Write a protein that binds this ligand. Structure first.
Ligand code: W2E
Ligand code: ZN
Length: 208
């Protein structure tokens, strides 16, 4: 029951999603190995993801979290990149979208930096890059990210360079403790704590 509504580039909603995408690009310590070398994107399309059942699944869990945390869902908008973006927008997040080997355990990972999620578009560590050219830095092939509504609730703060949340918590925050420019990354351990609200289709752009 998923439908995708195209946003117009003239729509304020397109513009504010694009701005979060572009303004949260940063350099990565791999020099571009996983995600490619770029400072910015060419945004090709932004679609709103509409699925009543998945939305209601999300809001149900959100109310549960909120009631366990002084009526505060601690809701954020966060990026997710995955080879499984098409399964996600149709069937929702679940345990098959978890990063089993992630540093905060087997859960579903999200980033404030769009460029961090870009590193997973073609798999962990960028996999073998784009299907057509086997290039992790492909400037031709169309990529997709999700910009998601995520319920964090009471988040366990991990300072740092499916499983369950830590007891008494609804999520984990990976707080960057070395790279002064990196934004936070977050993990949830229940697929119902995220809704894939925008599907963004883009290319990374070769620096001039
Ligand atoms: C089951 O699919 C995967 O193995 C997988 C692994 C990692 C990711 C992913 N891992 C992140 C880690 C930190 C910050 C952001 C992300 C993200 O957007 N995707 C997505 C899918
Ligand atoms: Zn390619």
């Amino acid at each position: 029951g998923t439908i995708l509504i195209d946003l117009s580039p003239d729509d304020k909603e397109f513009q504010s999603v694009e701005e979060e995408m572009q303004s949260t690009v940063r350099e990565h310590r791999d020099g571009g190995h996983a995600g490619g070398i770029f400072n910015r994107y060419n945004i090709l399309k932004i679609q709103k993801v509409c699925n009543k059942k998945l939305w209601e699944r999300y809001t149900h869990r959100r109310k549960e979290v909120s009631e366990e945390n002084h009526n505060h869902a601690n809701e954020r908008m966060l990026f997710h990149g995955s080879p499984f973006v098409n399964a996600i927008i149709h069937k929702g997040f679940d345990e098959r979208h978890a990063y089993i080997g992630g540093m905060f355990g087997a859960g579903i990972y999200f980033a404030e930096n769009s460029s961090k999620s870009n590193q997973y578009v073609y798999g962990i560590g960028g996999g073998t890059g784009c299907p057509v050219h086997k290039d992790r830095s492909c400037y031709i092939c169309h990529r997709q990210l999700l910009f998601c509504r995520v319920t964090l609730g009471k988040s366990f703060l991990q300072f740092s360079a499916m499983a369950h949340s830590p007891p008494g918590h609804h999520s984990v925050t990976g707080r960057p403790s070395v790279n002064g420019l990196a934004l936070a990354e977050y993990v949830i351990y229940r697929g119902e704590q995220a809704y894939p609200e925008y599907l963004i289709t883009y290319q990374i752009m070769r620096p001039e």
